[PDB]
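Ticket #1183: bound-state structure for zinc ion.
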Amino acid sequence: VEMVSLTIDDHEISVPKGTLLIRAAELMGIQIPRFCDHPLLDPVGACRQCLVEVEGQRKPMASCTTTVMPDMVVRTQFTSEAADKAQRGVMELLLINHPLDCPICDKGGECPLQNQAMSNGRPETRFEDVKRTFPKPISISSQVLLDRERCVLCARCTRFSSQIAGDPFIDLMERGALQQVGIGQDK
Amino acid sequence: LELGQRPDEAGPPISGPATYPDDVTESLRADAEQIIARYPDARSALLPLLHLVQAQDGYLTPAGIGFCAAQLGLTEAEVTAVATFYSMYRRTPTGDYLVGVCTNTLCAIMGGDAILEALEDHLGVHPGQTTPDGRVTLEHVECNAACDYAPVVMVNWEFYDNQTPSSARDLVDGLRSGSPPPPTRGSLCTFRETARTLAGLTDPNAPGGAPGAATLAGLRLARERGMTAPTPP
Amino acid sequence: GDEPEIIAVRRGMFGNRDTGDTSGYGRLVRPVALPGSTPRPYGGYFDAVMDRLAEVLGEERYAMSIERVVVYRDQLTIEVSRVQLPAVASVLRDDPDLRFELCLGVSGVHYPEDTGRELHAVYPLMSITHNRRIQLEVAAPDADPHIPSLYAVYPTTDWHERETYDFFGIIFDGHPSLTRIEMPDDWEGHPQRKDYPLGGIPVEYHGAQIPPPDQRRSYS
Amino acid sequence: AWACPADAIYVEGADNTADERYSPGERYGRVYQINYLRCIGCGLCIEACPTRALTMTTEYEMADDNRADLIWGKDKLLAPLQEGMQAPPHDMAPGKTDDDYYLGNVTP
Amino acid sequence: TPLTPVLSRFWDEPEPWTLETYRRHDGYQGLQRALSMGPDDVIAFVKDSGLRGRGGAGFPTGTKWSFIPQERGDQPAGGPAAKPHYLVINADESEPGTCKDIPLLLTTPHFLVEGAIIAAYAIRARHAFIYVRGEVLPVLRRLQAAVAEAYAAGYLGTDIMGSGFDLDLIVHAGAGAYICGEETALLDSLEGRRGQPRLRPPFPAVAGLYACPTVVNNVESIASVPPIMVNGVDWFRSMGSEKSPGFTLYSLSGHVTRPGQYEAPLGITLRELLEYAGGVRAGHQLKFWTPGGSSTPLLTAEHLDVPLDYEGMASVGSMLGTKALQIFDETTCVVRAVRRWTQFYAHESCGKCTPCREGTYWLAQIYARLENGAGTEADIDKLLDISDNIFGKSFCALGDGAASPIMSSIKHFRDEYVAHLDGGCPFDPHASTLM
Ligand SMILES: Cc1cc2nc3c(=O)[nH]c(=O)nc-3n(C[C@H](O)[C@H](O)[C@H](O)COP(=O)(O)O)c2cc1C
Ligand code: SF4
Ligand code: SF4
Ligand code: SF4
Ligand code: FES
Ligand code: FES
Ligand SMILES: [Zn+2]
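RESOLUTION: The complex was predicted; output attached.
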């Protein structure tokens, strides 16, 4: 198997060719925030939470979509102010419309959003405007309730229901800020 | 159970008749075979099919979503994802004429916002709503690549250039009651006819479509100034 | 040595000790390393203390005895190799320039994931004359939990070697009588070892009970 | 209960169905027990509450000959129904929402 | 520089859209010239022509065509069988101010048809698609009629001009979505999916339509291909500059007398175009303008002499874009226009990525508060920081385009932005209603 050397932050490691930057950071012990990335799902690069700074790239690169290449130099939020600013701005944008539901949320305590907002988010809000709202919760089946306001539209659910299980009965619907995971009709 | 979106939600969710009659489905399948035949991949026809069903009814319905899903082998909630994504796929009964005032920045401040306000006060109907007569559905549209003609008002996606509040009021009055004033660029036809046209099932040899003043402005200036057209080889 | 001392390997985001609540976040692998060897220019009087200790101890003896030097949060720890502990303790207590007469005790800490070095004994020493202080760290494997007892050098370590034994099983070879001091002599196990269960009972409630915290889910 | 060092609080949430609503919002604590033989009075619980639903009064006289009797349930802990209040199983104040309750914009 | 009409030359004639009129002016002669040359010959011809993309990208068309793998000579085995090549002509035109393509398609669709045939031959694509937005139904009808006429006249189908080339051209009427104009969202919509941009790589040149090699070109570049196949390359290079050769349409619109489409060489400064148009609306002065569509940073009078070419606008910090040239005068509030553009971007965001989806919503609300009396001094800083957090972080360039008006308007008119804090917009909208 082909192996490519690489430098994340100041440290250097070698990983199999085709590895994603987020996976290399995981193996090296660097915790890059991530919502849409999933090891078993094909990368989508939607949430933009996993941005890192890559030498020779003007824009921040979504580590969940950037395949490792030889001699590439990557600086995460731990060693790049630009990367940290990008990640924290993405977190802030991720939280502006989020409901103040942590006490009543079932995911509370086990929420990746809570943890990654603590570790990579602003201490307090700048958002003094009106939050986007949906009727909550809505049942998409006898078993699964959906709270569209808490949805970060990471598409992990839809990407699973399409790639892993061949049952795409949920999909992202509407457009823009109104976009929401849904079943379309009574089905 | 109450599955899916609540009916009273913003951006009206797909609703209406659950299924089409046998004859309606027969005609729809007859058209859909022709639509499918023209693409390397069947699913490529999903957008035209959504237009086709949007012609059978005045708007996208669960019946149309189901028809498209069955035709393309897709599931509902896969067709719905595409359907709800595009604006032209209206989701409430559309009147005989969709009057959309371009309220994008340019057209808006060139007068478009005033046009929209005047029409709202005239028809007494908010954008996106249909007149009680069911003949006009007022809406506001984003830029329609007719900026040089600003303000521009679309009627079933046919242009009306340089519209002033009085001109637009007269236009909507004509559309609602009687004769539809001719589009400045385009041949006006009912919403269903335009929906079928978008499906590619209407004769493309429609009348109208003269270049108009703005499109010629540059050529007219070049002639009036006797400007060297270009650089003869 | 000279490498970071990993006491535990933590894998998965959010400090999950097991598979994890949300799929796809468990692939991180972050070793939990304690602070490693400090670069030589130690801060404050630590430089003087270490220079004096290396002068009193022969270069060979110093290299054999001092396994590591750490300066963390402006506190000096000296990883002293087992066996050599009494010699360096005597040097520290007796050397006029070191004169660490006050040994504050012995603390046991268990690192079940630290191969060959599971049990650490910490000796906080203070020199009143020089108004200095340091800590010694002596590691021992779980298989041979033996350390040289400092009873001759620091009698105050008596009962401490006992408490640390009672709670960890470190044998402190040479102690005058290493008998359990806290737990009953018939007690089985060493409570403060991480493998020893907390030994709580469920909290009783009307129609329900809460298991002890060691049984319930936690994140670290 | 999460913050209690002594595991002295047991709480079970449930949905505020429109037929029977006990608190604003989606969830209410239908079972709430404090084992006062495990309570250490630290006050971490009240510091933990995001709604001020839990306070600590100055009342202290409390003792029983029975272990079970000192596990105080929701009925024993609920504050007395004051003047202007209504039975808990009722709909929210007209033209009010959970945010209004938390912002303090509700009245008898 | 002279206002060079090439594509516009037919216009003002009776029924210029017909195939007969197009032929009357060397129509489809360029296609014959193309077929006389090899497909790689055509690719090199266009590359030497230096025809840069006419959408927002501005990338060289010749190189883009060359990127398609075509197994030229190298055909080791038929088992791989290659994959079909697809030419998609991006007839979508939804960038605010971008109204150059719709008039061209409505008046002389045969320019685009001939260019598309030439390009498909160049990249050896047996199928071509015209993706045209559905809100220009007259353009859809004109384009369908032109394609039908080309089919009847033997320009399409199989054995075009007995050259052995085969091409079936399909006009796809896309529904309403600005984002669909972006490639890999154009392809996603054309495949029957949500018009959301794809993750790149793989790029359309290898994994385009139906996961096959594909090239997406704006209608302007395609329509400019035939005029360069005739008249040669040197003629095209005789306009513009070395780094921006050729001619382009400029969509003068807004507070300008005699607005319309002006076909001019690249690099013509806005001053010349205004002079040709008769200057800004009489009785007012230029306040600001968009060189390209709203996606491009705003420019003011200080840049009125900058050449309208990719290099110049890059040197000024803007992008040439689609040459939308939206013009606004003293009567217009920059905050008002930028709020409307932000509303457009929020309405048009595909919603895929957090930065654009959420930041456009937040910015629209902030601008709504600014135009009203609810503005705050920290609101300007929040606008700038949010725009920074969107620009460069969003998945596609739509987020950058949404941020661009905000950043540019702030940089040029922080004074006006602050003035809005004093109780709202001072400007009277009626003053700008263009009568
Ligand atoms: C949000 C967005 C919208 C776009 N809209 C269009 C469009 O309407 N027309 C267009 O030709 N290009 C548009 N583009 C640019 C395309 O990505 C692509 O570069 C172009 O269609 C073809 O390139 P060419 O002009 O060099 O042939 C858009 C890009 C973005 C990011
Ligand atoms: S519902 Fe789906 S898209 Fe929304 S946050 Fe959960 S996994 Fe992501
Ligand atoms: S005072 Fe409250 S938090 Fe503290 S132990 Fe008692 S019940 Fe728990
Ligand atoms: S920036 Fe992101 S959310 Fe906005 S249109 Fe592009 S992909 Fe969609
Ligand atoms: S996790 Fe990579 S962009 Fe979302
Ligand atoms: S702004 Fe109205 S058509 Fe473009
Ligand atoms: Zn204003």
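RESOLUTION NOTES: Residues 241-329 of chain E form a domain with the Ubiquitin-like (UB roll) fold (CATH 3.10.20.600).
TICKET STATUS: resolved
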